[PDB]
Design goal:
This is part of a larger assembly, with seven protein chains of seven kinds. With 213 residues, chain B is α+β, with helices and mostly antiparallel strands. Chain B is 34% helix and 26% strand. With 249 residues, chain G is of the alpha+beta class. Helices cover 36% and strands 24% of the residues of chain G. Chain G is built from six helices and ten strands. Chain G has a five-stranded antiparallel beta sheet. Chain G has a five-stranded antiparallel beta sheet with strand order 3-4-5-6-7. Classes of the chains: A mainly alpha (98), B alpha+beta (213), C alpha+beta (179), D alpha+beta (237), E alpha+beta (230), F alpha+beta (242), G alpha+beta (249).
Chain lengths: 98, 213, 179, 237, 230, 242, 249
């Protein structure tokens, strides 16, 4: 698109998760990525409504990002966003109704 | 995405197309645009008997940890941001662990973070420090490659300083001799000369870690 | 397209910031005794000036205190460094007084936000090399507000009018000048 | 039983939670709408007029667009969301198609929005009912009603809220082709319908009037008092 | 009793009972005190590992966040560890963004905001800890407390944990505003000794201080010297 | 999914009127389901772990029954509790050690590994989907600047470092015996540490051991690699002790 | 009861018992008062964090500044009040960035009330147990005063009260409030009288009351918090006036 790094930066967690899952499946077996995915989903299913900012403490502990700072944490603060939609529309969009 | 999706942080790629058109348009109309600040002066480093000597001419010697220091060349903002981020990460690591950090950890962090952005962040670094294992010296390039060498040079007067080292470098030197060699090699490329000395005798690896001032 | 020219000079318990005028706004107030000047593309200047006030107002509401010039410099640097791969075309200049100590402060930044703190004067624009010699020649330490105003006006004029803001502890003086 | 979940059917085919959502509607203030020959009139009862209250912020009549207005009965906080969504959708449809929106189109949009919230156990329905009235592009007056379940109908005169039974019984016999001859007659009919269930005189009446090629107008208390006095004089005569 | 199991359920009188039970869990932990003096703050607590089979330099209850901030807890240790890590990360982020050490009040507000989230969603559990935070900013000391519900207060002197009402009563009559650091340490150790239930030694209590030089955890030798002094 | 169960002791995310977590407390009683006891003792320049071996059926292949594991080339482990849970936690520990090495460029320490495992275990007690594992872990290793290390973590997410610890059914008696011995003396050679551990187990269990009823694993400053003793060496130690 | 387990269930008569309980939770908090005058607006509250060992930091404990033209006061749960105030500040700054003009008070109140209402309709969430009072000035209607409920309802008042003894305070204000002929001094005197008769204390003291005032001077809005000297003077004046009125009988 506009820049070579735009698509790479947008999809980084997904690629990292895919690489870790592939390595784990090749080394140990099918059970470990299954358990990791189920834990991720379980801890991610609880959080604030989409029009308010969350913290993601348990998910960060599970992923291991609780002792690391990146450029996503110091640039363009998502908590102090300059635009936000209507609450009901955001909640309906998260549910797939739109 | 959509106006109904929550926002996310990080870099922004919104002005790319407009800038791409504008730069060519101004080029073919004959107007100038602001640029970025760059540094390209000579930096060197030598491994002596029980420490590391880092030198630069005029500060360009950054702080990473009480036992690790760095020098940079290229775009100033990139070097500043990378050094600050790595220093913060190493401080968090030391607080969690309770011991002074290792040079290999900093080298690995810098390698991975420079490789993630495919060389678009222009920062060439010279890294040195003293560990429980001993003194180590590295050299990192903007694309994400590293060399572990007993002496390195970067900048404009690289050839003269490298010649001085290849002519006059011997293993297991002294502090004064290493400092004199670094100063002579730096002066061979050209202001003043700035020297940083890291010594094993002034570091205690047995006491618990405390946050430095 | 011409861009612009912004200058700042430091005196004795007072600062001055100047910009050129022809016969869009380039100097915006960010506090009681704090000013910022921008030079470059007009759209980018307006966008940066409007986005800085959002963060400044939120910071002053949450913290409960007046901001310091160094913190404003850091905020500007962060805002400029985000969008590093496609940048705004602006070159900020900051001049002001300490809200609690009343000490002068001047600074300059580049396209992507690399700060430069200088003790005597800073120059921004596309004619920095032309005005650097004049600033070096006509600057002397410990200048009274009238002398500082005269020397900054001369520096602007020797390189189409100018506007000069003089910041004092208890007053602000604005003067529009023509050659 | 069979009433503790939104999506559970009774053994005889009833959804009891959606029926309970209408008991909230049956407890709101009375609203009356009458469709005239070339005019449309709305009227809402005013209840519990506090002394230190501002009446500007508690109005129950809203204007969705230049030719559509609406009145509601039920929960007050639920109506605001629907009103805002309809207001946005009107302009969106005006962007899509140049011609002004249709009363039936906006009623269908509101009905679909209300019906969307009776499909899952994770959300509760809207406890409101509305009277949508307006004019079409050709110039034919229209009147519609919406239910919390998502059904809508076309009417000639209707009432919602408490007292709807008596008001509808009055309207069924007092609504003829002679009482809608003029705007004054239609307004008098609406006031008479309201006065059946409203005590303390005509001080608890809010009226809205819309004509062809004009905007919504809210009658003044002096005009309401004048109409009430005329009605009383005619009744005494 | 029907409203005592759910976290997102209001009682008919308008009460949330699970937060009260989390506070009860807090009230059953080891005692800890904190006193704000004229030129410093002192934090004291009672150790859990009261045995000879314990390695001294393994786990500590008094931890530093920044060079000028430290904290102690009363409640569940596992819940305390993750909050400590999050606080450290937040302080580092603030320094990176603003190029200036974070004030104590901002850190307390952010930590309380993190704690509040776990009291409004289903399928989770509130934290069972209460924190005491000390700092030094702009040449004056600070002392804060944070509840499991996400509310914070500023104190001159306070106690929490097992038998804290009598500790607060003792502090009320034993506290002086224009008080130095050494006498503050003596008063804190005496308040801890009031309800120790045993014999104190320099190996079953922890003390930390904060002053102009920054936060620092005291060594066992200094603790023994203070205990001998009093 | 299913939904929480009403009661003060039937779900993991429900407090009691005294602020207790009975579901977490019930996971500490699953450690005694196996019926075995473990003992770990740290010496001057060595660390020893001793556990109990029980093979009731004569049709079992005794080579496949063990409770000592190798996490890294320099880290050993002993597990007490449910067998499948112990094996799963061993696999997770290996994965975490590999991640640490890849990310930081050097081998993980014992205390850092224990802290990571405890951090993972803490999450299971705050979410209404997972359940705690009924097992406890004990790790030994040699630090290049500190010496031998002994660490233990609990199902609740709590970990600590010791000079000598125990787990299983007779944990309290083992703790009292070790406390008396450590109070008497703490500076031991390699031969005295293993004898101390074996004597502790024998005295507490009131039994005379055969070389096929116990398992021994050691680390040493001279040889940092984790090693598992053989039947001949165990018999030699038992003969010397007797 | 079988119809009061969650916010997404209707009773057979059409009621929301969880929302009713959340509204009932407000009665445990302190008293907050607001009065509208001809040349200003008033806000008076009651201090609850009274203790010999408590410290005094910040400017106030129950009054917050939202932007250059508005201020609010909360009653209920402090942890939820903090989130609500932060969201209000964000909304005001967003509108200012969008339009280069300050946000109107009713628009801000409606924006917050939509968020408050959204938490009473989707399951798995607990509604906010907070009530708020808003004061401000705008170019469309001038001085204004609003109120909000945990259910998402708001309204405009000339004098109102939330918290403990709210019914008695409202009755007294209704009995002894004049419409159209009030000034700041008379409003302050009425507020002092109402607070004295409302708080269950034999003698009122200046260390358990906080008063804020909003006004316009030279095209600027001024928000200030009164000092203990002024509060003491007002209390002394009220006491001596009451003594005079009693004696002249």
């Amino acid at each position: 698109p506009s820049h070579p790094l735009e698509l790479s930066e947008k999809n980084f967690q997904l690629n990292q998760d895919k690489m870790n899952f592939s390595t784990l499946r090749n080394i140990q077996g099918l059970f470990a990525p299954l358990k990791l995915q189920m834990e991720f989903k379980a801890v991610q299913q609880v959080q604030r409504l989409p029009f308010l900012s969350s913290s993601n403490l348990s998910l960060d502990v599970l992923r291991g990002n609780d002792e690391t700072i990146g450029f996503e944490d110091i640039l363009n603060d998502p908590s102090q966003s300059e635009v936000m939609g209507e609450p009901h529309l955001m909640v309906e969009y998260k549910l797939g109704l739109l | 995405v959509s106006v109904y999706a929550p926002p996310v942080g990080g870099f922004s790629f919104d002005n790319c197309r407009r800038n791409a058109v504008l730069e060519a348009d101004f080029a073919k109309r004959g107007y100038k645009l602001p640029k970025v600040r760059k540094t390209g002066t000579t930096i060197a480093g030598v491994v002596y008997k029980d420490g590391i000597v880092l030198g630069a001419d005029t500060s360009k010697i950054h702080f990473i940890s009480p036992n690790i220091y760095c020098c940079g060349a290229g775009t100033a903002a990139d070097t500043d941001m990378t050094t600050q981020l790595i220093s913060s990460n190493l401080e968090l690591h030391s607080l969690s662990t309770g011991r002074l950090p290792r040079v290999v950890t900093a080298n690995r962090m810098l390698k991975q973070m420079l490789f993630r952005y495919q060389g678009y962040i222009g920062a060439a670094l010279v890294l040195g420090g003293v560990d429980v294992t001993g003194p180590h010296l590295y050299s990192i390039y903007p694309h994400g490659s590293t060399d572990k060498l007993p002496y390195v040079t970067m900048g404009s007067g690289s050839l003269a300083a490298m010649a001085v080292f290849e002519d006059k470098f011997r293993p297991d030197m002294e502090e004064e001799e290493a400092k004199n060699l670094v100063s002579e090699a730096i002066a061979a490329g050209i202001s003043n000369i700035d020297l940083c000395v890291i010594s094993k005798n002034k570091l205690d690896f047995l006491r618990p870690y405390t946050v430095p001032n | 397209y011409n861009g612009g020219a912004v200058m700042a000079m430091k005196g004795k318990n007072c600062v001055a910031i100047a910009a050129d005028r022809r016969f869009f706004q380039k100097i915006f107030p960010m506090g009681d005794r704090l000013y910022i000047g921008l030079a470059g593309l007009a759209t980018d200047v307006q966008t940066v000036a409007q986005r800085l006030k959002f963060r400044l107002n939120l910071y002053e509401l949450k913290e409960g205190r007046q901001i310091k010039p160094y913190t404003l410099m850091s905020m500007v640097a962060n805002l400029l460094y985000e969008k590093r791969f496609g940048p705004y075309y602006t070159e900020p200049v900051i001049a002001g007084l300490d809200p609690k100590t009343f000490k002068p402060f001047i600074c300059s930044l580049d396209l992507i936000g690399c700060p430069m703190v200088t003790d005597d004067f800073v120059v921004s624009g596309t004619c920095a090399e032309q005005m650097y010699g004049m600033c070096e020649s006509l600057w002397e330490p410990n200048m009274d507000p009238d002398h500082l105003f005269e020397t900054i006006s001369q520096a602007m004029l020797n390189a189409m009018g100018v506007i000069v803001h003089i910041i004092e502890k208890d007053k602000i003086t604005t003067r529009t000048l023509k050659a | 039983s069979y009433d503790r979940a939104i999506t559970v059917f009774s053994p005889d085919g009833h959804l009891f939670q959606v029926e309970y959502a209408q008991e909230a509607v049956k407890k709101g203030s009375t609203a009356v709408g009458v469709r005239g020959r070339d005019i449309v009139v709305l009227g809402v009862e005013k209840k519990s007029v506090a002394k230190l209250q501002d009446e500007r912020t508690v109005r129950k009549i809203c204007a969705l667009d230049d030719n559509v207005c609406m009145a509601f009965a039920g929960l007050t906080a639920d109506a605001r969301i629907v009103i805002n969504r309809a207001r946005v959708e009107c302009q969106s449809h005006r962007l899509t198609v140049e011609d002004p929106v249709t009363v039936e189109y906006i009623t269908r949009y509101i009905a679909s929005l209300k019906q969307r919230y009776t499909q899952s156990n994770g959300r509760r329905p809207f406890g409101i009912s509305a009277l949508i009235v307006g004019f079409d592009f050709d110039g034919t007056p229209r009147l519609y009603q919406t239910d919390p379940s998502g059904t809508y109908h076309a009417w000639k005169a209707n009432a919602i809220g408490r007292g709807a039974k008596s008001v509808r019984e009055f309207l069924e016999k007092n609504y003829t082709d002679e009482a809608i001859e003029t705007d004054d007659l239609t307004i008098k009919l609406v006031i008479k319908a309201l006065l059946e269930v409203v005590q303390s005189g005509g001080k608890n009446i809010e009226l809205a009037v819309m004509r062809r090629d004009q905007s919504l107008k809210i009658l003044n208390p002096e005009e309401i008092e004048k109409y009430v006095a005329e009605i009383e004089k005619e009744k005494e005569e | 009793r029907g409203y005592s199991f759910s976290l997102t359920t209001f009682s008919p009188s308008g009460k949330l009972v699970q937060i009260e039970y989390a506070l009860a869990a807090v009230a059953g932990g080891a005692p800890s005190v904190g006193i704000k003096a004229a030129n410093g703050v002192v934090l004291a607590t009672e150790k859990k590992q009261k045995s000879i089979l314990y390695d001294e330099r393994s786990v500590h209850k008094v931890e530093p966040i920044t060079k000028h901030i430290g904290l102690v807890y009363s409640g569940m240790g596992p819940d305390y560890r993750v909050l400590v890590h999050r606080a450290r990360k937040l302080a580092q982020q603030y320094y990176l963004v603003y190029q200036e050490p974070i004030p104590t009040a901002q850190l307390v507000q952010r930590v309380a905001s993190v704690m509040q989230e776990y009291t409004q969603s289903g399928g989770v559990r509130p934290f069972g800890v209460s924190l005491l935070i000390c700092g030094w900013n702009e040449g004056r000391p600070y002392l804060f407390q944070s509840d499991p519900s996400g509310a914070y207060f500023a104190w001159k002197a306070t106690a929490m944990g097992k038998n804290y009402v009598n500790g607060k009563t003792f502090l009320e009559k034993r506290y002086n505003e224009d008080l130095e650091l050494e006498d503050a340490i003596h008063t804190a150790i005496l308040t801890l000794k009031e309800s120790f239930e045993g014999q104190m030694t320099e190996d079953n209590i922890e003390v930390g201080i904060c002053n102009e030089a920054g936060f620092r955890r005291l060594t066992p030798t200094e603790v023994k010297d203070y205990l001998a002094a009093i | 999914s299913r939904g929480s169960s009403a009661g003060f002791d039937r779900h993991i995310t429900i407090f009691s009127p005294e602020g207790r977590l009975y579901q977490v407390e019930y996971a500490f009683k699953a450690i005694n389901q196996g019926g075995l006891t473990s003992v770990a003792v740290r010496g001057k320049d060595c660390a020893v772990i001793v556990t109990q071996k029980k093979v009731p059926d004569k049709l079992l292949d005794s080579s496949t029954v063990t409770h000592l594991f190798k996490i890294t080339e320099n880290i050993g482990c002993v597990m007490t509790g449910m067998t499948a849970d112990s094996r799963s936690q061993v696999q997770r520990a290996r994965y975490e050690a590999a991640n640490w090495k890849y990310k930081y460029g050097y081998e993980i320490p014992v205390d850092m590994l224990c802290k990571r495992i405890a951090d993972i275990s803490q999450v299971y007690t705050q979410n209404a989907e997972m359940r705690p594992l009924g097992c406890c872990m004990i790790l030994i290793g040699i630090d290049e600047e500190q010496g031998p290390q002994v660490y233990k973590c609990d199902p609740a997410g709590y970990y600590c470092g010791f000079k000598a610890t125990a787990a299983g059914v007779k944990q309290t008696e083992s703790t009292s015996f070790l406390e008396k011995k450590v109070k008497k003396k703490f500076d031991w050679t390699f031969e005295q540490t293993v004898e101390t551990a074996i004597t502790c187990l024998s005295t507490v269990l009131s039994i005379d051991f055969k070389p096929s009823e116990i398992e021994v694993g050691v680390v040493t400053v001279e040889n940092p690699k984790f090693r598992i003793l053989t039947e001949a060496e165990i018999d030699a130690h038992l003969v010397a002790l007797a | 009861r079988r119809y009061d387990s969650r916010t997404t269930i209707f009773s057979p008569e059409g009621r929301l018992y969880q929302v009713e309980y959340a509204m009932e939770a407000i009665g445990h908090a302190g008293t907050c008062l607001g009065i509208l005058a001809n040349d200003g607006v008033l806000l008076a509250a009651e201090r609850r964090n009274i203790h010999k060992l408590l410290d005094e930091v910040f400017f106030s404990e129950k009054i917050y500044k939202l932007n250059e033209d508005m201020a609010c006061s909360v009653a209920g749960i402090t942890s939820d009040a903090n989130v609500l105030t932060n969201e209000l500040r964000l909304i005001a700054q967003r509108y200012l960035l969008q339009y280069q003009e300050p946000i109107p008070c009713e628009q801000l109140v409606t924006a917050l009330c939509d968020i408050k209402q959204a938490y009473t309709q989707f399951g798995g969430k607990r509604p906010f147990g907070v009530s708020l009072l808003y004061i401000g000035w705008d170019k469309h209607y001038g001085f204004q005063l609003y109120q909000s409920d945990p259910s998402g309802n708001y309204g405009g008042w000339k004098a109102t009260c939330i918290g403990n003894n709210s019914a008695a305070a409202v009755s007294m204000l209704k009995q002894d409030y004049k419409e159209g002929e009030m000034t700041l001094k008379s409003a302050l005197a009425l507020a002092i009288k109402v607070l004295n008769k409302t708080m269950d204390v034999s003698k009122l003291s200046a260390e358990k009351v906080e008063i804020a005032t909003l006004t316009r001077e030279n095209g600027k809005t001024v928000i200030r918090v009164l000092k203990q000297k002024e509060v003491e003077q007002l209390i002394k004046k009220h006491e001596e006036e009451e003594a005079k009125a009693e004696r002249e009988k």
